[PDB]
């Protein structure tokens, strides 16, 4: 028996009122599916939201433990297992996800196999085990039949684009998605709606449409209880203010950091952007990671040195970064720092070009401001933002 | 630099 | 009794070899559909390509006459009639199309009704009986059920955007189309593939991806026999060379003009672009329309005067155009001319801005060249092209 | 100026 079923019986023998609470929470018409779920092994709810809503409402502190055990007992050929994979992937519960993937790829249900293979492409691409050309080839090799994995195959490319500073394709890929084509799985369609809200938030951030960025993050926040989506919504709102309002930027990052608490991966996004925010506004930084050999961390060490007038040491560290593999957006930042250190218009022009190439309309303001101060034609600088 | 996620 | 059936019999009277030629031309496995078609009222081929290929092969000089009579005698509830509407619209045979639309809107077949209503939106928008906001609202209200008309509804918006100099939405709309969703009607799928090649060619032209622009126009030309698609493919190729290669631009416009022969509307596209080409390269220009009150035509009169160093006359005519309604792309040309007349950097800056607003990455080169000659920083001008 | 069509 799965741990969730044991706990619910324990709690229900003390309190028969819990049946109606769980029925309502689970979106059931009557208690009968819940009776069946408690008493007969392998009975799944029609919608996976039923079990998640119960676990979150009744056992908020034990969600991971109970859902891990529940998911890894599911028949992997079922709708329930396919929903559980989306749950696991959405939450970045990698140990649940990878175990589901591995057993779904091997099973005889063609849908479950398709879901397993496509989520696996996402996992491989995000870890750097494959590149984007291999990912695309693997999507083509899969001969995808479901509307949902057709959509997910677009989303996984969008996630990679965002992570690799290659923003131009994201709005194009977005136009290929139609969520109304997902018919059978309301749990998953709903999860995908939240995914799309957070993706759209980032798309508008990168287009310098800050009001729409904030609107879509707020939409995600209003309709989710998944830590991952809350974290990224507050992160993206914080970034929307990074050039315009120190206090609101910081506030949103501190909120998000509190939502991230106890997940180091999530916490790191906030520490990184707080590092950048404090450096950009010339404040004493408490957030920098001096031990990391990630280029973005090393960039913040350098920016701090620039604020501390240690230009010679900043330049020596920046030269070490020229040896490193960087994406186009990262190179925007690189050349902006180089410009601040050397006072060469050349470096600011390169910074502009890299931000154009990554289709970053937010960050491009940084080198543009410096070029304006160095006597470049303001009208031309304005035209570059169009 | 700035990091992003969804 | 349709004219096409009668002509065939009369010809077959003197040559029974014609029968086999027609079967192969029509893509038939055996002659039996053709015997059925000739001898029995209302017998349509499975694919409309069959009758089109016959008419074009055997009766190229009688195409309109025969197809008018054939199409107007179709049962409007049939696949044949739906295919005939696409034929008529693709060829811009407006009298055939509008008659089919009017009888399809009134019939009790839901697919034929949908086709009639959606092509009607296109016809109304293109004639300026409605604006693009009403066309969009009308599409929403129609509650389209076929993959075909869902795609056609995107195409009609794309045609309008191209005609009104509003290029930015076009690539977004393109990304929403998936021709693989069209299952019933190979004739229509095929016609849409050609439509999309020519649309995509324009999308790439306006994005300044000249090689891909040429690729898709040349692709359309390689396999079409439809005047309309030949005309717009050669036009788009000639435009792709307008700033880079006078002789190849003119070549492609002159080939196109030869395919346009006898259709004044199609000929006018080439006359207009040949006027622009010859003005831009300061060559003798037999193409100018001195009588027209269209802004684009009046622009070429002005550009000729500029080449004749008649700046005072050019200015007087340009000032008359400031009272006229113009789209943003036309305004890019307006301010380019103004710059050439007045030598004011400001007019060239506005030209640049209007080309940015219309998302014309090709034409923007003209004012940028003049700003480079007036001492503006070439690096900034290069960034503006990205 | 320049015209276009498809």
Rounded Cα–Cα distance for residues C356 and C364 (Å): 8
- Whether residues A269 and A293 fall in one domain: no
- Resolution, in Å, please? 1.9
Domain boundaries, position A327? 288-386
DSSP secondary structure letter of residue A146: S
Query: Domain check: are A257 and A304 in the same one?
Result: no
Note whether C346 and C330 are within 8 A (CB). no
Angle at the Cα of C245 from the Cα atoms of C240 and C248, rounded to 5 degrees: 75
Q: Which of C57, C65, C61, C67 is nearest to C19 (CA)?
A: C57
Q: Is residue C350 part of a domain?
A: yes
Q: How far apart are CA C138 and CA C298, in angstroms?
A: 35
Q: What share of chain B is helix, strand, coil (3-state, %, to 5)?
A: 0, 0, 100
Residues of chain C contacting A, Cβ within 8 Å:
171-173, 175-176, 178, 349, 352-353, 356-357, 376-377, 379-381, 383-384, 386
**Residue A296, φ and ψ in degrees, nearest 5:** -65, -35
Contact B3 A269 (CB under 8 A): yes
In whole angstroms, what is the distance from residue A116 CA to residue A136 CA? Answer: 16
- Residue C41 lies inside a defined structural domain of this protein: no
Alpha helices in A308-344 (DSSP H): 311-322, 328-342
Contacts of A195 (CB under 8 A, 6+ apart): A90, A155, A229, B6
Establish if C361 belongs to a structural domain: yes
Of A179, C248, A217, nearest to B4 by C-alpha is A217
- Pick from A67, A36, A27: nearest CA to A186: A27
Within a domain: C369: yes
Give the three-class secondary structure for A225: coil
> Among A138, A115, A110, A151, which Cα is nearest to C178's?
A151
Q: Find, among A231, A244, A317, A243, the residue nearest to A276 by Cα.
A: A243
User: Does residue A30 lie in a domain region?
Assistant: no
Q: Given A220, A246, A273, which residue is the final one in a domain?
A: A273
State how far the Cα of C139 lies from the Cα of C158, in Å rounded to an integer.
Answer: 14
At which of A220, A244, A273 does a domain end? A273
How far is residue A95's CA from residue A112's CA, in Å, rounded to a whole number?
18
Do A383 and A307 have their domain in common? yes
* Longest CA pairwise span in chain C (Å): 77
Judgement on whether residues A386 and A294 belong to the same structural domain of the protein: yes
The answer to whether the Cβ–Cβ distance between D5 and C273 falls below 8 Å is: no
Is the separation of the CB atoms in A90 and A191 below 8 Å? yes
CA separation for the pair A162, C154 (Å, rounded): 28
DSSP A90: H
Consecutive H or E run containing C50: helix C49-58
Q: How far is it, in rounded angstroms, from Cα C230 to Cα A351?
A: 44
Which residues of C fall within a CB distance of 8 Å from D6?
158-159, 162, 195, 198-199, 201-202, 232, 236
- 3-state class of C18 per DSSP? helix
Tokens 């016609």, residue located:
C191
Handedness of CA A308, A311, A316, A322 (dihedral sign): positive
Residue C40 forms part of a structural domain: no
Joined together, the tokens standing for residue C199 give 């649309």
A360 and A292 co-located in one domain: yes
Dihedral of the CA atoms A104, A109, A111, A117 (nearest 10)?
30
Contacts (Cβ under 8 Å, ≥6 apart) of A308: none
Q: Collapsing DSSP states into helix, strand and coil, what is residue A168?
A: helix
Phi-psi region of A61 (alpha: psi -120 to 50; beta: other; left: phi over 0): alpha
Would C102 be classed as within a structural domain?
Answer: no
Four-residue CA torsion sign, A296, A298, A301, A306: negative
Residue whose pair of structure tokens reads 């034609």 in the numeric block: A377
Closest Cα partner for C199 from C179, C172, C170? C170
Tell me how far apart the alpha carbons of residues A221 and A238 are, in angstroms, rounded to a whole number: 14
State the method.
X-ray
Q: CA-CA distance, A352 to A374, in Å (whole number)?
A: 14
Please enumerate in sequence order all residues whose Cβ is within 8 A of that of A41, keeping only pairs 6 or more positions apart, or say none. A1
Q: How far apart are CA C116 and CA C96, in angstroms?
A: 12
End position of a domain, from candidates A248, A273, A298: A273
Coil, strand or helix at A242: coil
Cα A217 to Cα A170: distance, rounded to the nearest angstrom? 17
Residues A247 and A334 in one domain: no
CATH number of the domain where residue A266 is located: 1.25.40
Contact residues, chain D, for C159 at CB < 8 Å: 6
| CA distances to A174, C99, C345 from C311, in Å | 50, 51, 17
Q: Give how many domains chain A has, as a whole number.
A: 2
- What is the distance between the alpha carbons of residues A27 and A262, in angstroms, rounded to a whole number? 31
Furthest-apart CA atoms within chain B: distance in Å: 17
Q: Are residues A379 and A293 in the same domain?
A: yes
What is the residue whose two structure tokens read 């470049």?
A376
Helix (H, G, I), strand (E, B) or coil at C286: coil
Characterise C47 by phi-psi region: left (phi > 0), alpha (psi -120 to 50), beta (else): beta
How far apart are alpha carbons C177 and C156 in whole angstroms?
A: 12
Q: What is the C-alpha separation between A52 and A54, in angstroms, rounded?
A: 5
**Rounded to the nearest 10 degrees, what angle do helices C79-91 and C110-127 cross at?**
10
Is residue C15, in this structure, part of any structural domain at all? no
User: Would the CB atoms of D4 and C236 count as touching at under 8 Å?
Assistant: yes
């Amino acid at each position: 028996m799965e741990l969730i079923r044991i706990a619910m019986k324990k709690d229900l023998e003390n309190d028969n009122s819990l049946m109606n609470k769980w029925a309502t929470v689970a979106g059931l018409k009557n208690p009968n599916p819940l009776y069946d779920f408690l008493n007969h092994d392998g009975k799944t709810f029609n919608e996976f939201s039923s079990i998640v809503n119960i676990v979150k409402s009744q056992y908020p502190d034990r969600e991971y433990e109970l859902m891990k055990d529940y998911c890894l007992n599911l028949d992997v050929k079922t709708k329930a297992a396919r929903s559980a994979l989306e749950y696991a992937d959405a939450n970045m519960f990698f140990e649940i996800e990878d175990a589901l993937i591995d057993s779904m790829i091997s099973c005889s249900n063609m849908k479950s196999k398709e879901y397993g293979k496509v989520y696996k492409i996402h996992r491989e691409l995000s870890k750097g085990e494959i590149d984007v050309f291999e990912a695309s080839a693997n999507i083509g090799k899969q001969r995808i039949k479901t509307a949902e994995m057709n959509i997910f195959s677009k989303m996984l490319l969008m996630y990679d684009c965002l992570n690799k500073g290659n923003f131009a394709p994201m709005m194009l890929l977005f136009q290929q998605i139609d969520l109304s084509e997902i018919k059978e799985n309301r749990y998953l369609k709903n999860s995908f709606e939240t995914r799309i809200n957070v993706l759209l938030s980032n798309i508008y951030l990168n287009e310098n449409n800050l009001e729409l960025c904030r609107e879509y993050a707020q939409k995600a926040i209003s309709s989710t209880d998944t830590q991952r989506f809350l974290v990224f919504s507050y992160l993206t709102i914080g970034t929307s203010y990074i050039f315009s309002d120190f206090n609101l930027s910081k506030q949103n990052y501190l909120i998000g950091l509190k939502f991230a608490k106890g997940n180091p991966g999530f916490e790191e996004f906030f520490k990184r952007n707080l590092s950048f925010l404090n450096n950009f506004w010339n404040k004493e930084n408490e957030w920098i990671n001096y031990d990391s050999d990630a280029v973005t961390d090393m960039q913040e060490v350098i920016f701090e040195l620039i604020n501390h007038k240690e230009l010679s040491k900043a330049l020596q560290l920046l030269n070490k970064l020229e040896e490193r593999d960087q994406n186009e957006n990262e190179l925007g930042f690189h050349y902006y720092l180089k410009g601040l250190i050397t006072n060469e218009k050349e470096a600011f022009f390169k910074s502009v070009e890299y931000f154009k190439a990554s289709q970053d309309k937010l960050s491009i303001k940084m080198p543009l401001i410096q070029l304006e101060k160095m006597g470049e034609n303001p009208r031309l600088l304005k035209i570059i933002t169009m | 630099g700035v990091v992003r996620g969804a």
